[PDB]
Coordinates of N, CA and C and ligand atoms in Angstrom, one line a residue:
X1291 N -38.2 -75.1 35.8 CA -37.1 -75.3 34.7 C -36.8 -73.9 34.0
X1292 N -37.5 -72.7 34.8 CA -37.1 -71.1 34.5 C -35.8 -71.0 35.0
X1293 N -35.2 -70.9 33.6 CA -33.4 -70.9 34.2 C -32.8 -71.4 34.2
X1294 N -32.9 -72.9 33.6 CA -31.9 -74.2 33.9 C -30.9 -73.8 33.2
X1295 N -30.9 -73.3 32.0 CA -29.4 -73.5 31.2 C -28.7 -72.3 31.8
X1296 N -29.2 -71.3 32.7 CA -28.4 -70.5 33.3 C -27.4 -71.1 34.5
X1297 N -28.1 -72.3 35.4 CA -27.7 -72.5 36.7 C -26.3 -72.6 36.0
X1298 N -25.8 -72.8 37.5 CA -24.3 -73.3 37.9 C -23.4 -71.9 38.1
X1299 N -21.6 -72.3 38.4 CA -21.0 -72.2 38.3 C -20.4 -71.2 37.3
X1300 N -20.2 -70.0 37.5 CA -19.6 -69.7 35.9 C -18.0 -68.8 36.3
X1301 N -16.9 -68.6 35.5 CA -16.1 -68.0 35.5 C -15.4 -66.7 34.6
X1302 N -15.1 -65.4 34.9 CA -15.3 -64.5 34.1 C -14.0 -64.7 33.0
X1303 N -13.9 -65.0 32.0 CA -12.4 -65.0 31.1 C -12.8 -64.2 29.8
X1304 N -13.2 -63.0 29.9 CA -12.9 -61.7 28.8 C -14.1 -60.4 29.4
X1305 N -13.3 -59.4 29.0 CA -14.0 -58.1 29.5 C -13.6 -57.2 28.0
X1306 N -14.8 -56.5 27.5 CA -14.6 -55.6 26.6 C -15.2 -54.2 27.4
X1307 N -14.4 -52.9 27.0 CA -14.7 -51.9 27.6 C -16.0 -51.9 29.0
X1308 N -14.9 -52.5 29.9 CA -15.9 -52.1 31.2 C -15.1 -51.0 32.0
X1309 N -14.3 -50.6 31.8 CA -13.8 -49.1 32.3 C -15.1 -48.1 31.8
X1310 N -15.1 -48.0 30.3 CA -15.6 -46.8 30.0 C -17.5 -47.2 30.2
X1311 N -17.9 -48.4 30.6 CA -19.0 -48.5 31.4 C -19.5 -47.8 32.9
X1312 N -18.5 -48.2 33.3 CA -18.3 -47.8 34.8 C -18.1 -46.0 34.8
X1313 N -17.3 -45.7 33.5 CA -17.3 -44.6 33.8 C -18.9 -43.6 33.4
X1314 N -19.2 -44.2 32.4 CA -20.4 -43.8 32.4 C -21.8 -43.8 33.3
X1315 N -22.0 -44.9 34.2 CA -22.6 -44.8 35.3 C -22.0 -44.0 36.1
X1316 N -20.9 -43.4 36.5 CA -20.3 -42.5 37.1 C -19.5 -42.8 38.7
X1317 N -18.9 -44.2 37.7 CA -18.0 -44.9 38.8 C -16.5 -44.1 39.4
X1318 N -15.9 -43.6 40.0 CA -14.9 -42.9 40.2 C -13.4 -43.9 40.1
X1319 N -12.0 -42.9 39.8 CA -10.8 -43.3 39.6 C -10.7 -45.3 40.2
X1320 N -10.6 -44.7 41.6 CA -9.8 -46.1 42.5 C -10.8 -47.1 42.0
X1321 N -11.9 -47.0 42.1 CA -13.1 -48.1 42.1 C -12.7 -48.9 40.8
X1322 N -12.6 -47.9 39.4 CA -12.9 -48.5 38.8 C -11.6 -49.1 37.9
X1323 N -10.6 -48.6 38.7 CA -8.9 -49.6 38.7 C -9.2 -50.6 39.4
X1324 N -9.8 -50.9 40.5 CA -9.1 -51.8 41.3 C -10.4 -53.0 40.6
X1325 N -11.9 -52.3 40.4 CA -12.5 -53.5 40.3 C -12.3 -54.0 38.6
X1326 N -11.8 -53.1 37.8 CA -11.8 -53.5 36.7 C -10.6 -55.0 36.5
X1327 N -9.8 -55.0 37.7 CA -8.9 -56.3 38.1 C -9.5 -57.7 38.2
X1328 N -10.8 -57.6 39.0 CA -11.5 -58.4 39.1 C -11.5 -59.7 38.2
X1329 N -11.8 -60.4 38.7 CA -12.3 -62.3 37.5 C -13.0 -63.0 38.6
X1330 N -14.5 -62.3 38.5 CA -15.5 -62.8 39.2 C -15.9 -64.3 39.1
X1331 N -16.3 -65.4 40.0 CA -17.0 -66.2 40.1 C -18.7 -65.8 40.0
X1332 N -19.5 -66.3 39.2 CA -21.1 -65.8 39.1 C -21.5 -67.4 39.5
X1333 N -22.4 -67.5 40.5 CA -22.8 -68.3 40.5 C -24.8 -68.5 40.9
X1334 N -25.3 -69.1 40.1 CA -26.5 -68.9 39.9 C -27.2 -70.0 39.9
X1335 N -28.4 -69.9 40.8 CA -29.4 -71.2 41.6 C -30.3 -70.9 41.0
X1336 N -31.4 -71.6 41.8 CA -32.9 -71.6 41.5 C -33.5 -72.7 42.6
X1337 N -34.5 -71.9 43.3 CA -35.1 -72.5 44.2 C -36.7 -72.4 44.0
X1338 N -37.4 -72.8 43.7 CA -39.2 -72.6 43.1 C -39.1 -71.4 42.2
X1339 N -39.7 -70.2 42.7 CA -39.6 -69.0 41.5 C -38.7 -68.1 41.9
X1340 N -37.6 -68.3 43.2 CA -36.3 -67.3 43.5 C -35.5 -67.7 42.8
X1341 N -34.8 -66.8 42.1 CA -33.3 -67.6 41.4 C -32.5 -66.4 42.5
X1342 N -31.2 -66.7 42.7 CA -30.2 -66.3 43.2 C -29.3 -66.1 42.3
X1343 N -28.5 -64.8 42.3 CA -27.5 -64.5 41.3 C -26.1 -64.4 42.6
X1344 N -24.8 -65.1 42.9 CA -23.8 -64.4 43.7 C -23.0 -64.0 42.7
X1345 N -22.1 -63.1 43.3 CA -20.9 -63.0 42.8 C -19.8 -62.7 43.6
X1346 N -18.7 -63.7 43.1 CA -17.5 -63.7 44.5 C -16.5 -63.3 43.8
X1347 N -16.0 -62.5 44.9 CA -14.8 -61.5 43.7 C -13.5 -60.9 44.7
X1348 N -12.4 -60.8 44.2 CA -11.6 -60.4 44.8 C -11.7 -59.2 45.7
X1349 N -12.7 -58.2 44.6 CA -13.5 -57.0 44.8 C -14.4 -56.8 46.0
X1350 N -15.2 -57.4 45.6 CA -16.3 -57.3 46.5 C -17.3 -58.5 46.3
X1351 N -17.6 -58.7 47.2 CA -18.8 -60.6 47.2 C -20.2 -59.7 47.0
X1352 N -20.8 -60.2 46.5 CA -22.5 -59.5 46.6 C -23.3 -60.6 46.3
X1353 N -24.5 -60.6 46.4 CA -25.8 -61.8 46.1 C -27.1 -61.2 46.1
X1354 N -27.6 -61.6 44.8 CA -29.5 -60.8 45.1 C -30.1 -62.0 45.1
X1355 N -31.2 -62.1 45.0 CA -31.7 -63.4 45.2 C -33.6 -62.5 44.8
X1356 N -34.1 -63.0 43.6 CA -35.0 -62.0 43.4 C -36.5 -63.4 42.9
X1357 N -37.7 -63.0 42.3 CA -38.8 -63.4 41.4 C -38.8 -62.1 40.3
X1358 N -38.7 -63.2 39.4 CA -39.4 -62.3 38.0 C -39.9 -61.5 37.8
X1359 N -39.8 -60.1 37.4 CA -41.2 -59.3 37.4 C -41.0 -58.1 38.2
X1360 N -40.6 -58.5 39.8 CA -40.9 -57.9 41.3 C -39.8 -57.3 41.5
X1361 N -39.9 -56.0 41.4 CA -38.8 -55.3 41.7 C -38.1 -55.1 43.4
X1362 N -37.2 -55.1 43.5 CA -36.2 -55.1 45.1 C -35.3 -54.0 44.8
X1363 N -34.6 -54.3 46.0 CA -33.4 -52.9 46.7 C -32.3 -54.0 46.1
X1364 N -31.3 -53.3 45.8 CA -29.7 -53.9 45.7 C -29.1 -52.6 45.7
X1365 N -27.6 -53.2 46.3 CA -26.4 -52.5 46.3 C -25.7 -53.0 45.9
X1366 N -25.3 -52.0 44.3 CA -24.1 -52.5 43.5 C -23.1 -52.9 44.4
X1367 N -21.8 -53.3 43.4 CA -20.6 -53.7 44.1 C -20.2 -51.9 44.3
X1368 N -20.2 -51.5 43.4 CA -19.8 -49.8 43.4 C -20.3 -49.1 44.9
X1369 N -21.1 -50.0 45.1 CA -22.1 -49.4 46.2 C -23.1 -48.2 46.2
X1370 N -24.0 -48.3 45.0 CA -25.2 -47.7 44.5 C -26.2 -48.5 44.7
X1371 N -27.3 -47.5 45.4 CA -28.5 -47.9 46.2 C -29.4 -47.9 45.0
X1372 N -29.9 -49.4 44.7 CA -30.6 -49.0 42.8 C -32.0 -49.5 43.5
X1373 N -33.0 -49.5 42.7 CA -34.0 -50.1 42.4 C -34.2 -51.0 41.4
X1374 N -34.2 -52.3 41.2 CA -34.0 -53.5 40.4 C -35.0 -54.4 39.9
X1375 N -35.1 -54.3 38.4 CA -36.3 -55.5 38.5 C -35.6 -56.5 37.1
X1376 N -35.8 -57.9 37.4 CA -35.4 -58.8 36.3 C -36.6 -59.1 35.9
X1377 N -36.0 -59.8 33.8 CA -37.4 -60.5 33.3 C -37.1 -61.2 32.7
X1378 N -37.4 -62.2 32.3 CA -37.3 -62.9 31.1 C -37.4 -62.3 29.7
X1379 N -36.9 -62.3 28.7 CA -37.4 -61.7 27.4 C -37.1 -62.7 26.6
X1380 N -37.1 -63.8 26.1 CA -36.9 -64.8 24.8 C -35.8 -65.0 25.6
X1381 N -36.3 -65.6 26.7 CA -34.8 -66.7 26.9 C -33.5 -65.9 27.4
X1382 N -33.5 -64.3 27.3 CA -32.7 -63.6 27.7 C -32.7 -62.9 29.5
X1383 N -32.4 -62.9 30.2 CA -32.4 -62.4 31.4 C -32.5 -60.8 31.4
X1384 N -33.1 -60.3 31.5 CA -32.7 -58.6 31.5 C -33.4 -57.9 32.9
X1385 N -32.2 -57.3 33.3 CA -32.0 -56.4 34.6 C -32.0 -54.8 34.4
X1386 N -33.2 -54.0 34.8 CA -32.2 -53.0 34.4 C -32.7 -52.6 36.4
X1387 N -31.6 -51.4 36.1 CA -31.3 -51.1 37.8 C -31.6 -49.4 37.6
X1388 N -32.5 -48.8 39.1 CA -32.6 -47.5 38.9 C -32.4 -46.9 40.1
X1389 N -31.5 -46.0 40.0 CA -31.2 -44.7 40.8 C -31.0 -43.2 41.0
X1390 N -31.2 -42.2 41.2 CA -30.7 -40.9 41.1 C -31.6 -40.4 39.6
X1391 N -32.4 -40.8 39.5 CA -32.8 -40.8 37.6 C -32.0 -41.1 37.2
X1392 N -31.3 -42.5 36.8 CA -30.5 -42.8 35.9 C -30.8 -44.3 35.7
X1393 N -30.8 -45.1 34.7 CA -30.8 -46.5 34.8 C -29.9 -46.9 33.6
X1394 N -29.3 -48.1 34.3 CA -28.7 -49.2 33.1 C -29.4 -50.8 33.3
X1395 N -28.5 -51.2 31.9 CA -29.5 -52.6 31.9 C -28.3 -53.6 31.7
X1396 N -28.7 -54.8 32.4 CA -27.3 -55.8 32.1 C -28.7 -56.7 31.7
X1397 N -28.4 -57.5 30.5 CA -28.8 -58.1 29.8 C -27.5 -60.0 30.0
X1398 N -28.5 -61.1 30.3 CA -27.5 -61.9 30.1 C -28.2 -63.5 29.7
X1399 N -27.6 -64.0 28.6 CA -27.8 -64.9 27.7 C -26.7 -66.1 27.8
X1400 N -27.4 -67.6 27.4 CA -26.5 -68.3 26.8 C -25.9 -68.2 25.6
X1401 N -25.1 -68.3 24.9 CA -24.2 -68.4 24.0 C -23.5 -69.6 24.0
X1402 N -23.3 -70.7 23.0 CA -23.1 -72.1 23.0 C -23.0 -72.3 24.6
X1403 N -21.3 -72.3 25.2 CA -21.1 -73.5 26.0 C -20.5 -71.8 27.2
X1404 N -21.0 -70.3 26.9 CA -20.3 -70.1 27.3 C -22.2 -68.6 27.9
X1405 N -21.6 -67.8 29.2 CA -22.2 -67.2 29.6 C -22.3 -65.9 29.2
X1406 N -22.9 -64.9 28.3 CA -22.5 -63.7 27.9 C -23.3 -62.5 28.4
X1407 N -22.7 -61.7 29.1 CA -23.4 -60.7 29.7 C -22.9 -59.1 29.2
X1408 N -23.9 -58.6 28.9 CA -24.2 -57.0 28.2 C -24.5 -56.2 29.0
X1409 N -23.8 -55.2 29.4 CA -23.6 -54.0 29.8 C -24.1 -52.7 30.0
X1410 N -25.2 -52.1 29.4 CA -25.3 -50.9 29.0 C -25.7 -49.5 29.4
X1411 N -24.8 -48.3 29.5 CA -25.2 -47.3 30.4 C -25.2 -46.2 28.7
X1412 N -26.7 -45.8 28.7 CA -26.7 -44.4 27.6 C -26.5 -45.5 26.0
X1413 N -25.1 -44.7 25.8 CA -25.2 -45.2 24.4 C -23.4 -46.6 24.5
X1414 N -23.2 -46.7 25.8 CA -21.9 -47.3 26.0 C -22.3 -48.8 26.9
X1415 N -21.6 -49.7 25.9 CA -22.0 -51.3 26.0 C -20.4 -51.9 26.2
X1416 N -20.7 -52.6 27.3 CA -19.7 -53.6 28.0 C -20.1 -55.0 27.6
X1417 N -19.1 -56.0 27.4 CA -19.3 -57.3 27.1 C -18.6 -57.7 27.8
X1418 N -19.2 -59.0 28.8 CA -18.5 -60.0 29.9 C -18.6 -61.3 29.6
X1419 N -17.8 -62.1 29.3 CA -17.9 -63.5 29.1 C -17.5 -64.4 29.8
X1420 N -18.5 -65.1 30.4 CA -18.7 -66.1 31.3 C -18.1 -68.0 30.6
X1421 N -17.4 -68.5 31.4 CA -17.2 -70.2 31.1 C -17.6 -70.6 32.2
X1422 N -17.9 -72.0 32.2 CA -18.2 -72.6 33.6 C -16.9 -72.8 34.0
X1423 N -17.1 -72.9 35.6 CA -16.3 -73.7 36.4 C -15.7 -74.0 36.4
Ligands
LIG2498 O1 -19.9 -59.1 34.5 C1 -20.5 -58.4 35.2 N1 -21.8 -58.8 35.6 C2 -22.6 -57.7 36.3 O2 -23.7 -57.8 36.6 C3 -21.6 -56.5 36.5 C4 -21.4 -56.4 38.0 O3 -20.7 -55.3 38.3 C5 -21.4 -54.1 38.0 C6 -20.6 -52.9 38.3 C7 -20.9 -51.6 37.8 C8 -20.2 -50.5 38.2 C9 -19.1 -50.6 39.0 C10 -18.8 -51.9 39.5 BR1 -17.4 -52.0 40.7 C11 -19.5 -53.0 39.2 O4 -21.5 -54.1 36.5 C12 -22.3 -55.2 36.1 S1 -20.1 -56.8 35.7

């Protein structure tokens, strides 16, 4: 029951500064026009202690599928080769991802009826708001 109020379906309807996110991970021009277009589907399982995160996008489709704790290989949608580990912290999901010496953290929480996900590269924070389906 790690994760239940996460599962399902979710739909992206608001983006605060994810340009100047992207730019601060050191996302380039086209990338971060074309994905900043984006209105991802997130959709998130749970199978014993794997939870699965997809995301289907006009952009680019990606899927990790991870355990708590145990860090893995992912490739952004940007297509950055990170080293990744999720955790629980009070009910909050927190990711942070490492490459090149650099790391950011996406942090993601329920909020009443809606999905909210946090951004952060340095001192520059993105906010993504998730509705279901
Ligand atoms: O709502 C979101 N939920 C996530 O986990 C995000 C997925 O996309 C990445 C990303 C970073 C840089 C460039 C591109 Br293209 C994508 O940012 C985090 S956005």
């Amino acid at each position: 029951h790690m994760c239940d109020a996460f599962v399902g379906t979710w739909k992206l309807v608001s983006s605060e500064n994810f340009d100047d996110y992207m730019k601060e991970v050191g996302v380039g021009f086209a990338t971060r026009k074309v994905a900043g277009m984006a209105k991802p589907n997130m959709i998130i399982s749970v199978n014993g202690d794997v939870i699965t995160i997809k995301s289907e996008s006009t952009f680019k489709n990606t899927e990790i599928s991870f355990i708590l704790g145990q860090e893995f290989d992912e490739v952004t949608a940007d297509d950055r080769k990170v080293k990744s580990t999720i955790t629980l912290d009070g009910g909050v999901l927190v990711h942070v991802q490492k490459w090149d010496g650099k790391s950011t953290t996406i942090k993601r929480k329920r909020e009443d009826d809606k999905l909210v996900v946090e951004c952060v590269m340095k001192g520059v924070t993105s906010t993504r708001v998730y509705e279901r389906a």
